[PDB]
Coordinates of C-alpha atoms in Angstrom, one line a residue:
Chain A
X1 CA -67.9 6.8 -25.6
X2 CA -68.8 3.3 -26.3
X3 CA -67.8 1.6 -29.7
X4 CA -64.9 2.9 -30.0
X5 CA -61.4 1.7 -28.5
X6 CA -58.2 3.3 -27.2
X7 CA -55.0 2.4 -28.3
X8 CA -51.5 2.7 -26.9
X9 CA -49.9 6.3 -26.5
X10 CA -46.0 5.0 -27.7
X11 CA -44.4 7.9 -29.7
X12 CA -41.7 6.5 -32.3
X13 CA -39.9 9.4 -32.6
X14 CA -39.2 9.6 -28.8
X15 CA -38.2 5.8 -29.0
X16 CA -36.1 6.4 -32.1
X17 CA -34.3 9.0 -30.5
X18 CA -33.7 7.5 -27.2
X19 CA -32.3 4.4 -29.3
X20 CA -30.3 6.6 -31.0
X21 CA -28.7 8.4 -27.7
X22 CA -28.4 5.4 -25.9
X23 CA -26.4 3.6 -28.6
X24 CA -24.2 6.7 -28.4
X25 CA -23.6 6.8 -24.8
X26 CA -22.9 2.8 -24.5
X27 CA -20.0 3.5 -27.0
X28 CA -18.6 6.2 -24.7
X29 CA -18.5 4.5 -21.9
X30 CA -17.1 1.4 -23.7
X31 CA -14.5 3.9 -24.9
X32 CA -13.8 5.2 -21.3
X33 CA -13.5 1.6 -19.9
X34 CA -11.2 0.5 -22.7
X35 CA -8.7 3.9 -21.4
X36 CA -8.9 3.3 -18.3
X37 CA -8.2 -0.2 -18.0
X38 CA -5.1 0.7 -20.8
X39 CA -3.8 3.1 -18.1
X40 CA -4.0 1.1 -15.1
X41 CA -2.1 -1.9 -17.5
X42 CA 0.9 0.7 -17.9
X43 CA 0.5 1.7 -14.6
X44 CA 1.1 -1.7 -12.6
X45 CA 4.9 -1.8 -14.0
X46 CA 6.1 0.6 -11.7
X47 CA 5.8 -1.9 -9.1
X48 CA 9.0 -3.5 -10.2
X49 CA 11.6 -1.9 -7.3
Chain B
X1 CA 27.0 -4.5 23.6
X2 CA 29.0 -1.0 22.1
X3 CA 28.9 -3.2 18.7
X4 CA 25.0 -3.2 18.5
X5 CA 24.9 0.7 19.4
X6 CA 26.7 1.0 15.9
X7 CA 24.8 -0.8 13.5
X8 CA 21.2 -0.4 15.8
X9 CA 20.4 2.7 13.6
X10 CA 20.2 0.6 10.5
X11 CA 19.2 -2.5 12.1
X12 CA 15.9 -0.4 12.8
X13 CA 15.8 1.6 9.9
X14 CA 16.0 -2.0 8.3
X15 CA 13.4 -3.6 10.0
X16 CA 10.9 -0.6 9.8
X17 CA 11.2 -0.4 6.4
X18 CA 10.1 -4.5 6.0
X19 CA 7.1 -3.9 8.3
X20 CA 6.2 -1.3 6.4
X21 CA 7.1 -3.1 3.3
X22 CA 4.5 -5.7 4.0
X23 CA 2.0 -3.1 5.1
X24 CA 1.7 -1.5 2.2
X25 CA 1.4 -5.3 0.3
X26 CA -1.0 -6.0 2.3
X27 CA -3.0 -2.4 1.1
X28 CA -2.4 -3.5 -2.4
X29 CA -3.7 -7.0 -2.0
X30 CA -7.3 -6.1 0.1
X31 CA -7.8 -3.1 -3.1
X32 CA -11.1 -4.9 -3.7
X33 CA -12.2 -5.5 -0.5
X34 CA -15.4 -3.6 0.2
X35 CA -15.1 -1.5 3.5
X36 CA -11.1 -2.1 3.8
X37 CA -9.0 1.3 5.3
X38 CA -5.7 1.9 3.6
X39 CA -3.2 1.8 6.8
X40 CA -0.2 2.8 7.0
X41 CA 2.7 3.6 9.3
X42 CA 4.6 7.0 9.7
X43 CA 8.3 6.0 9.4
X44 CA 10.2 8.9 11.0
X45 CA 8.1 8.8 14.2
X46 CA 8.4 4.8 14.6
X47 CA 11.2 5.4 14.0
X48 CA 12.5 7.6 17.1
X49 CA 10.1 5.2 19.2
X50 CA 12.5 2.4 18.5
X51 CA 15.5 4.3 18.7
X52 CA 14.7 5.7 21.8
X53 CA 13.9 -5.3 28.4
X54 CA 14.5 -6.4 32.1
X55 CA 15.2 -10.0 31.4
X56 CA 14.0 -12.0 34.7
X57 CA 16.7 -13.2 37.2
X58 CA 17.7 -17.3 37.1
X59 CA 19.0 -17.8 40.2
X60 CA 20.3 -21.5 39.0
X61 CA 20.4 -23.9 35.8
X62 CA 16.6 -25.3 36.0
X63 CA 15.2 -21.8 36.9
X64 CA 13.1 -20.6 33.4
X65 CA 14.5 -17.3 31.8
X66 CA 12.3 -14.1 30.8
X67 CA 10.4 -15.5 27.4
X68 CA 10.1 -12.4 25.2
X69 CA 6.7 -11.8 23.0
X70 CA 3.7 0.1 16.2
X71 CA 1.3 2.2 15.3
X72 CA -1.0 2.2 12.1
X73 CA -1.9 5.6 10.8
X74 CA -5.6 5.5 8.6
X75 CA -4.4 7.0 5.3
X76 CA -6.5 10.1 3.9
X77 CA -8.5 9.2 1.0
X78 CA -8.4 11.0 -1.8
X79 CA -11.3 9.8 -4.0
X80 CA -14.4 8.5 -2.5
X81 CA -15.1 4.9 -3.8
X82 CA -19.0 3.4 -3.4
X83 CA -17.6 0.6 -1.4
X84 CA -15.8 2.2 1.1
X85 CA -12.3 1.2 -0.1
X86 CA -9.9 3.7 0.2
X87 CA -6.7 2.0 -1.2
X88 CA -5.7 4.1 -3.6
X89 CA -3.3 2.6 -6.7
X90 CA -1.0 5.0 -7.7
X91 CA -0.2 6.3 -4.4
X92 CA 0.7 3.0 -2.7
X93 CA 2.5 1.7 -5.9
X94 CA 4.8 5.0 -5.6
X95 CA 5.2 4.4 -1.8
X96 CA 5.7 0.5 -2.4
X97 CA 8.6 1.2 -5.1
X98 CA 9.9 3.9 -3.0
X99 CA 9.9 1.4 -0.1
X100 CA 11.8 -1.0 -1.7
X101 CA 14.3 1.5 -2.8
X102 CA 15.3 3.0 0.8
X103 CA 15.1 -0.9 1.9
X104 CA 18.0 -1.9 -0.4
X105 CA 19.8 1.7 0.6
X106 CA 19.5 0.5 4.4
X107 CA 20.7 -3.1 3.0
X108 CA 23.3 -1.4 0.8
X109 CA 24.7 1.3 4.1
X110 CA 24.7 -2.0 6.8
X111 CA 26.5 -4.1 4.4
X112 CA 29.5 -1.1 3.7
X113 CA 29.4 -0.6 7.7
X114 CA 29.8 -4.2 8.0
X115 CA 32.3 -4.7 5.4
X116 CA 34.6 -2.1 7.2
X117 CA 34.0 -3.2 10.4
X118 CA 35.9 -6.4 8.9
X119 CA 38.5 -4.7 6.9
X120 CA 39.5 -3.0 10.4
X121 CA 40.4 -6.7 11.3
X122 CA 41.4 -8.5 8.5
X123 CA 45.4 -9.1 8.8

């Protein structure tokens, strides 16, 4: 068809959403890094005889 | 010597339990090397090796005498790491306290041995 033009095909719920879920999921693995590193802290006094 | 057949039980024990000693420090320091196999020794085996030489003849003062000069056991990993290390914390940090505790009972068992060896004389 000529005269008209095609724009992009970005949804903004899909992008909302995937903002929304990977905000989420960088907190939970923040929250898992933060434990894990607590634990090995405690951990690396057995060391002492 | 009969004296050395007394104390060459602990003497060994001893000495086994340094070389392991620095074998597992040596796990412990190379965690983060890519590739690096946790080693390790097994101490009951080594240790009837050592329990269970010929020092050349010098036939007169300028003649030269004889000049003197284990095992490691690839530990089973338990989680597998992206890097290929298999040095596992917890594990070796047990083994490396537990290691240092038998070393000071060894240090602890010579010394009393020692002590009564001398007590024998004393007089």
């Amino acid at each position: 068809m000529s005269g008209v033009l095609e724009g992009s095909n970005v949804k903004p719920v899909e992008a909302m959403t995937d903002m929304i879920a990977n905000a989420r999921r960088f907190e939970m693995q923040m929250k898992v890094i933060t434990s894990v590193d607590e634990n090995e802290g405690r951990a690396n006094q057995l060391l002492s005889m | 010597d009969r004296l050395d057949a007394a104390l060459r039980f602990q003497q060994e024990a001893l000495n086994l339990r340094a070389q392991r000693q620095e074998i597992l420090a040596a796990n412990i320091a190379n965690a983060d090397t890519p590739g690096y196999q946790a080693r390790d020794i097994d101490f009951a085996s080594e240790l009837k090796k050592v329990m269970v030489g010929v020092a050349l003849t010098l036939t007169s003062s300028h003649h030269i005498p004889a000049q003197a000069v284990v095992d490691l056991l690839y530990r089973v990993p338990d989680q597998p790491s992206l890097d290929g290390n298999t040095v596992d914390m917890d594990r070796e940090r047990t083994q490396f306290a537990d290691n240092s505790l038998k070393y000071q009972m060894g240090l602890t068992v010579l010394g009393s041995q020692l002590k009564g060896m001398m007590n024998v004389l004393q007089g």
